[PDB]
Amino acid sequence: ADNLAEFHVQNQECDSCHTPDGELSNDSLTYENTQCVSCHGTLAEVAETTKHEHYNAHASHFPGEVACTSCHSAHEKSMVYCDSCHSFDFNMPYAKKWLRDEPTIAELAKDKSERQAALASAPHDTVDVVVVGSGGAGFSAAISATDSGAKVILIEKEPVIGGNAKLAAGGMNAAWTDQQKAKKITDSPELMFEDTMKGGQNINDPALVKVLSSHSKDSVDWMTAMGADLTDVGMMGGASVNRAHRPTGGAGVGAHVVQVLYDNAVKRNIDLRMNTRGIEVLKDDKGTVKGILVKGMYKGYYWVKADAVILATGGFAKNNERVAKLDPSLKGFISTNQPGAVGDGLDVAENAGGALKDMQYIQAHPTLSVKGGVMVTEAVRGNGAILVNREGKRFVNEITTYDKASAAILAQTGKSAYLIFDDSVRKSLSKIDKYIGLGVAPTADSLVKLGKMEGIDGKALTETVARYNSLVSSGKDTDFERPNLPRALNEGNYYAIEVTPGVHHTMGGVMIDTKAEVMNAKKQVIPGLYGAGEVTGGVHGANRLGGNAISDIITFGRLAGEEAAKYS
Ligand SMILES: Cc1cc2nc3c(=O)[nH]c(=O)nc-3n(C[C@H](O)[C@@H](O)[C@@H](O)COP(=O)(O)OP(=O)(O)OC[C@H]3O[C@@H](n4cnc5c(N)ncnc54)[C@H](O)[C@@H]3O)c2cc1C
Ligand code: HEM
Ligand code: HEM
Ligand code: HEM
Ligand code: HEM
Ligand SMILES: O=C(O)/C=C/C(=O)O
Ligand code: NA
């Protein structure tokens, strides 16, 4: 067979997969995926038949209920979504190589000729608020709005939910929480505010950072009441005390939070539409929002009439062409992001009259695995790992800022360095087991042997670890001044992870005020238009701190949803 439908129709009728009239049920292909499940079982049941020792196409870290048509199309060959970050050995039937080629918003001007017909028709739906983007900010705002009494529609252009939020690991920053108090930490919303401004080089909009620190415990309490586990509190760079919240034992904060928000949206019956891209905010004759034109992958262009639109589309760190224009030093780098984090949400905000700010500030994460091509959390350093170069020595404060850590790593022999840790660090952060499972953390029972495997000077590494361990025991790093030294590297075996920088987060974006209202260049509010999460600029200034983006999306998403509901 040349394609999946053709293979099944050898022994089955069209209506084994299609509705009685033959029309696609909707852009999520809800009915059609229920039929695949009907015969093959759920994703978990299919996963029992495709087991590999350390990976499985049908059992991954993605949260929510991943549709089969996310990877299996029927009438044409299709792509494995995992290939957008990994290169596992797969043999999916009727596959084609991963290639993302999505027209820009500007390029969709070519469809003028179908857009006008859509716009001339009656609205397909009439609701109170449309939320664009199913990352942390967008689910947070959809739930908030709905909880406040508004009818919402939540769209996602991708076939799967979660954006980049689902990939987060290190934590959700908050201060003065009950979770901190249980671990015996002393903190406050004023120290979180202070750490943040200093980390953002004082470019941050102070009124936005105040909302960030003052709503942070609240956001943590909100998530926990919805079912989240945020009781592990670790340390991340540039924080004066531990404040990075995550699930028990140090699992990834990201996939967990997005799974909780999806489960909660599903319980409120929120209208969630996959493969549906927001294209153009529609305004009436006095410039206030009246709706949005969307492009459904399977059903074409239609418009939704609504009083408010909340853009929660994330950043543009996957778009290296746009990144390179703004920061030529990052051209050619690999990204840590999902394939659709390209900035089209910014283009929608601009066409509507919204202004942008801080666009030149782009953050590179210092430690991508050279071997796996994926981020390795800064929490591995926060829980005690050191960085060593090929000569077997320390060369930087490992919990310094992302900008300084990336430059120091790049300055080393080979433009990369190695994370080095033991079983005491490994056991303190369960996320480390995921790196071991990926195959990217070689191990040996002595540093001499470990350096010999990885090409690190073995006897100098042995001396380096002995010297760091005596600094830990003393309480002060006089070589690099790392201010937190939580454990000696001396229990069980040793591990090394080869690491190097990659493009990660865009701190600039659309201009919002403290109610998350989008403004134009004259600082005038555009009525009915909201912005929340990494699509906005002004929260993180010139350098975001680890853990502060998950705090930002929950807080600002929640608030945009409440204000849109009230505006109405
Ligand atoms: C690998 C990784 C790990 C991270 N770890 C952490 C952490 O531990 N702590 C932390 O503080 N930060 C962390 N960050 C940053 C953090 O995850 C975020 O900045 C991201 O979660 C922001 O969430 P968001 O909701 O604003 O956007 P996203 O979660 O990216 O979601 C936005 C969504 O909008 C959808 N969309 C975009 N444009 C449109 C359009 N036109 N039409 C329809 N849908 C649209 C996108 O496809 C996407 O799904 C991490 C980021 C990455 C990549
Ligand atoms: C779009 C929906 C579906 C998806 C994604 C899907 C997935 C697949 C795939 C990947 C294969 C292997 C093809 C090959 O080996 O070349 C397959 C085969 C098969 N499918 Fe489907 N399927 C779908 C719908 C259905 C439905 C509705 C039925 C039953 C009426 C069905 C029953 C089968 C059977 C019987 C086989 C052959 C092997 C077996 O005995 O399980 N599938 N399917
Ligand atoms: C001869 C039998 C079939 C006919 C005439 C038929 C008809 C169609 C048509 C006309 C479309 C596009 C409609 C639109 O764009 O609005 C479509 C798409 C689709 N069909 Fe079929 N279909 C058949 C068999 C199947 C089978 C066997 C499956 C699953 C195994 C299936 C699953 C789908 C899905 C999932 C889509 C969405 C697009 C895609 O994945 O290709 N159909 N079908
Ligand atoms: C419940 C939903 C799904 C169904 C029913 C389905 C169906 C199937 C079937 C019947 C096979 C053939 C393997 C076998 O059992 O011999 C298969 C293989 C495969 N599917 Fe799916 N699939 C689903 C979802 C997905 C998703 C969401 C992805 C990607 C994220 C995906 C990617 C693959 C890959 C890569 C293979 C080949 C596996 C390997 O070489 O290990 N599938 N699928
Ligand atoms: C259904 C699709 C995917 C599958 C089956 C898959 C599979 C895996 C596997 C086997 C690992 C090793 C640890 C573990 O067992 O969980 C892993 C880790 C990882 N993957 Fe994926 N992957 C998928 C898609 C993606 C995509 C598209 C991205 C980036 C957007 C990504 C980012 C990562 C990261 C950052 C890690 C490191 C450990 C962590 O943060 O948990 N994965 N993945
Ligand atoms: O887990 C990490 O390394 C990333 C955290 C962040 O970007 O806030
Ligand atoms: Na931003």
Curated annotation (Swiss-Prot):
<dbReference type="InterPro" id="IPR036280">
    <property type="entry name" value="Multihaem_cyt_sf"/>
</dbReference>
<feature type="binding site">
    <location>
        <position position="278"/>
    </location>
    <ligand>
        <name>FAD</name>
    </ligand>
</feature>
<feature type="binding site">
    <location>
        <position position="377"/>
    </location>
    <ligand>
        <name>succinate</name>
    </ligand>
</feature>
<feature type="binding site" description="covalent">
    <location>
        <position position="36"/>
    </location>
    <ligand>
        <name>heme c 2</name>
    </ligand>
</feature>
<feature type="binding site" description="covalent">
    <location>
        <position position="82"/>
    </location>
    <ligand>
        <name>heme c 4</name>
    </ligand>
</feature>
<feature type="binding site" description="axial binding residue">
    <location>
        <position position="40"/>
    </location>
    <ligand>
        <name>heme c 2</name>
    </ligand>
</feature>
<feature type="binding site" description="axial binding residue">
    <location>
        <position position="72"/>
    </location>
    <ligand>
        <name>heme c 3</name>
    </ligand>
</feature>
<keyword id="KW-0349">Heme</keyword>
<feature type="binding site">
    <location>
        <position position="534"/>
    </location>
    <ligand>
        <name>FAD</name>
    </ligand>
</feature>
<dbReference type="InterPro" id="IPR036188">
    <property type="entry name" value="FAD/NAD-bd_sf"/>
</dbReference>
<feature type="binding site">
    <location>
        <position position="170"/>
    </location>
    <ligand>
        <name>FAD</name>
    </ligand>
</feature>
<feature type="binding site">
    <location>
        <position position="137"/>
    </location>
    <ligand>
        <name>FAD</name>
    </ligand>
</feature>
<dbReference type="GO" id="GO:0030288">
    <property type="term" value="C:outer membrane-bounded periplasmic space"/>
</dbReference>
<feature type="binding site" description="axial binding residue">
    <location>
        <position position="18"/>
    </location>
    <ligand>
        <name>heme c 1</name>
    </ligand>
</feature>
<feature type="binding site">
    <location>
        <position position="431"/>
    </location>
    <ligand>
        <name>heme c 4</name>
    </ligand>
</feature>
<feature type="binding site">
    <location>
        <position position="549"/>
    </location>
    <ligand>
        <name>FAD</name>
    </ligand>
</feature>
<dbReference type="GO" id="GO:0019645">
    <property type="term" value="P:anaerobic electron transport chain"/>
</dbReference>
<dbReference type="InterPro" id="IPR027477">
    <property type="entry name" value="Succ_DH/fumarate_Rdtase_cat_sf"/>
</dbReference>
<feature type="binding site">
    <location>
        <position position="74"/>
    </location>
    <ligand>
        <name>heme c 1</name>
    </ligand>
</feature>
<dbReference type="Pfam" id="PF00890">
    <property type="entry name" value="FAD_binding_2"/>
</dbReference>
<feature type="binding site">
    <location>
        <position position="505"/>
    </location>
    <ligand>
        <name>FAD</name>
    </ligand>
</feature>
<dbReference type="GO" id="GO:0009055">
    <property type="term" value="F:electron transfer activity"/>
</dbReference>
<keyword id="KW-0249">Electron transport</keyword>
<feature type="binding site" description="covalent">
    <location>
        <position position="39"/>
    </location>
    <ligand>
        <name>heme c 2</name>
    </ligand>
</feature>
<feature type="binding site" description="axial binding residue">
    <location>
        <position position="75"/>
    </location>
    <ligand>
        <name>heme c 1</name>
    </ligand>
</feature>
<feature type="binding site" description="covalent">
    <location>
        <position position="14"/>
    </location>
    <ligand>
        <name>heme c 1</name>
    </ligand>
</feature>
<feature type="binding site" description="covalent">
    <location>
        <position position="85"/>
    </location>
    <ligand>
        <name>heme c 4</name>
    </ligand>
</feature>
<feature type="binding site">
    <location>
        <position position="550"/>
    </location>
    <ligand>
        <name>FAD</name>
    </ligand>
</feature>
<feature type="region of interest" description="Flavoprotein-like">
    <location>
        <begin position="118"/>
        <end position="568"/>
    </location>
</feature>
<feature type="binding site" description="axial binding residue">
    <location>
        <position position="8"/>
    </location>
    <ligand>
        <name>heme c 2</name>
    </ligand>
</feature>
<feature type="active site" description="Proton donor">
    <location>
        <position position="402"/>
    </location>
</feature>
<dbReference type="GO" id="GO:0016491">
    <property type="term" value="F:oxidoreductase activity"/>
</dbReference>
<feature type="binding site">
    <location>
        <position position="547"/>
    </location>
    <ligand>
        <name>succinate</name>
    </ligand>
</feature>
<feature type="binding site">
    <location>
        <position position="171"/>
    </location>
    <ligand>
        <name>FAD</name>
    </ligand>
</feature>
<feature type="binding site">
    <location>
        <position position="378"/>
    </location>
    <ligand>
        <name>succinate</name>
    </ligand>
</feature>
<dbReference type="InterPro" id="IPR012286">
    <property type="entry name" value="Tetrahaem_cytochrome"/>
</dbReference>
<feature type="binding site" description="covalent">
    <location>
        <position position="71"/>
    </location>
    <ligand>
        <name>heme c 3</name>
    </ligand>
</feature>
<feature type="binding site">
    <location>
        <position position="91"/>
    </location>
    <ligand>
        <name>heme c 3</name>
    </ligand>
</feature>
<feature type="binding site">
    <location>
        <position position="338"/>
    </location>
    <ligand>
        <name>FAD</name>
    </ligand>
</feature>
<keyword id="KW-0274">FAD</keyword>
<feature type="binding site" description="axial binding residue">
    <location>
        <position position="86"/>
    </location>
    <ligand>
        <name>heme c 4</name>
    </ligand>
</feature>
<dbReference type="InterPro" id="IPR010960">
    <property type="entry name" value="Flavocytochrome_c"/>
</dbReference>
